[PDB]
A paper describes a structure:
Intracellular nucleotide binding, leucine-rich repeat ([name]) receptors are key components of plant innate immunity pathways. The integrated [name] domain in the sensor [name] Pik-1 directly binds the effector [name]. The [name] [name] allele only responds to the effector variant [name]-[name], but the [name] allele responds to [name]-[name], [name]-PikE, and [name]-PikA.
To this end, we determined the crystal structures of [name]-HMANK-KE bound to [name]-[name], and to [name]-PikE. Each complex was crystallized and X-ray diffraction data were collected at the Diamond Light Source (Oxford, UK) to 1.6 Å and 1.85 Å resolution, respectively. The overall architecture of these complexes is the same as that observed for all Pik-[name]/[name] effector structures. A key interaction at interface 3, one of the previously defined Pik-[name]–[name] interfaces, involves a lysine residue (Lys262 in [name] and [name]) that forms intimate contacts within a pocket on the effector surface. In order to position this lysine in the effector pocket, [name] has to loop-out regions adjacent to this residue, compromising the packing at the interface (De la Concepcion et al., 2018, Figure 3A, B, C and D). In the PikpNK-KE mutant, the position of this key lysine is shifted one residue to the N-terminus compared to that in the wild-type, so that it occupies the same position in the PikpNK-KE sequence as in the [name] sequence. The cell-death response to [name]-[name] mediated by PikpNK-KE is similar but elevated when compared to that mediated by [name].
Author numbering:
A (entry chain C): 31 to 113
B (entry chain B): 187 to 263
């Protein structure tokens, strides 16, 4: 079943006061089952533990995420409202 | 840049979450701390020159088993 990002509830997040507001939501899946979600910057990168492996996740200007995800896992991005 | 560090902490209830957050907020160079994640089991820390291995050590001894889950830099254009 194609992961349906339109039916994913918002992450539980906090916009930290001393840094820019990040433009993206991310959602982490194992076997197409949501594991967690959060915020990240657009046109940027982050190191995240995805199950058994650290992954260097890149974001494009529209919050599309890419990385070398371990088998069975993926992290998908969406632009936040207003961004 | 500022760093953002996310740590998963074994935290039994809302008071243990309170205590892990108090411990982190007291740490050298922490600008801001929040409890995040679908299960409200992740501590997100933002600051300049935070020592993530010192921070994990402190949590492991005083609060609960802890796993580092994210390290990133704050984007400044």
């Amino acid at each position: 079943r194609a992961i349906d990002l339109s039916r994913e509830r918002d992450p539980n997040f906090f916009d930290h006061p001393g840094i820019p507001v990040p433009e993206c939501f991310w959602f982490m899946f194992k076997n197409n089952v949501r594991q967690d979600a959060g915020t990240c910057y657009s046109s940027w990168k982050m190191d995240m533990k995805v199950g058994p492996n650290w992954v260097h996740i890149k974001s494009d200007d529209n919050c599309n995420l890419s990385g070398d995800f371990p088998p069975g896992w993926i992290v998908l991005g969406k632009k936040r409202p207003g961004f | 840049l500022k760093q953002k560090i996310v740590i998963k902490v074994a935290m039994e209830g809302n008071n243990c979450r309170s205590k892990a957050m108090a411990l982190v907020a007291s740490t050298g160079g922490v600008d801001s701390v929040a409890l995040v994640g679908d299960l409200r089991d992740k501590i997100e820390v933002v600051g300049y020159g935070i020592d993530p291995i010192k921070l994990i050590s402190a949590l492991r001894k005083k609060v609960g088993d802890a796993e580092l889950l994210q390290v990133s830099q704050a984007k400044e254009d």
